[PDB]
Amino acid sequence: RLGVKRYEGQVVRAGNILVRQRGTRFKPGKNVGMGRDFTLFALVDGVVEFQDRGRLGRYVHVRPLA
Amino acid sequence: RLGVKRYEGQVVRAGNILVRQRGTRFKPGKNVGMGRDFTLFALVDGVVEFQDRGRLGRYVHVRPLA
Amino acid sequence: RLGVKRYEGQVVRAGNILVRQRGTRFKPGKNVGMGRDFTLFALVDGVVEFQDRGRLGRYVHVRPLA
Amino acid sequence: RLGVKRYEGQVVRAGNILVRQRGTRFKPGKNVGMGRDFTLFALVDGVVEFQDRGRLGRYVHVRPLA
């Protein structure tokens, strides 16, 4: 279905889906890509991190393991 | 480590961890996701709500933010 | 007719029928396949185990033995 | 992918895949054929039946419909 697929601090890998959405509820952050279907995926292995920039929207980042 | 990470009525945002468990000690409720490691996380922003259903399991819900 | 066909912890063999359902009353878990008729069967030889994932559904698994 | 595809007593048609295996995890029983890719399949229309001969191996048979 749609919705968030990862939790704060969860370890992920390249290609890994992070969020499914018809729109841009969540914006691509550092190390995060976005297909045409608005899906958000990890560009590298790391840790999922959510951040709310308020007016700028809700972004999703991936912090490289090392 | 393992254990509940939120309290009754706490205010959580999408992706926040609610419970870290080895098994299905707590069940995913409304607006609550669960990873392969059985981690329960908030699918949307809201209020944490614990519901004991007895033998039917103990649910963890996320009531849509007001 | 329809209904659960095995009990918790029952030892079963590959091919064995586990549950006969019209829909996804139960979902196939580890080592459990699901036919077109939604019938759940053991993919391997092992012990039957039931698991409730709440908002995510109730699964049926087969724990290999030895 | 790999794995047993039918459940005990399931009705299959001629040419239906019964099992997918890399080796001879299961031997071709009555009315059952095996492709070069060890894939078992029903030679006729009938009912799937598993037979565990232990040390002799494991055969998959298809009992003629009628």
UniProtKB/Swiss-Prot annotation, chains A, B, C, D:
Disulfide bonds: none
This protein's record includes keyword Transport: no
Organism for this UniProt entry: Thermus thermophilus (strain ATCC 27634 / DSM 579 / HB8)
GO molecular-function term, one example from the UniProt record: structural constituent of ribosome
Domain of life the protein comes from: Bacteria
Range covered out of full length: 20 to 85 of 85
The entry's keywords: Ribonucleoprotein, Ribosomal protein
Subunit and partners: Part of the 50S ribosomal subunit.
Gene Ontology BP term (one): translation
Function summary: Found on the solvent side of the large subunit.
Gene: rpmA
Recorded GO CC terms: cytosolic large ribosomal subunit
The protein's name: Large ribosomal subunit protein bL27
Similarity-based family: Belongs to the bacterial ribosomal protein bL27 family.
Keyword Ribonucleoprotein: yes
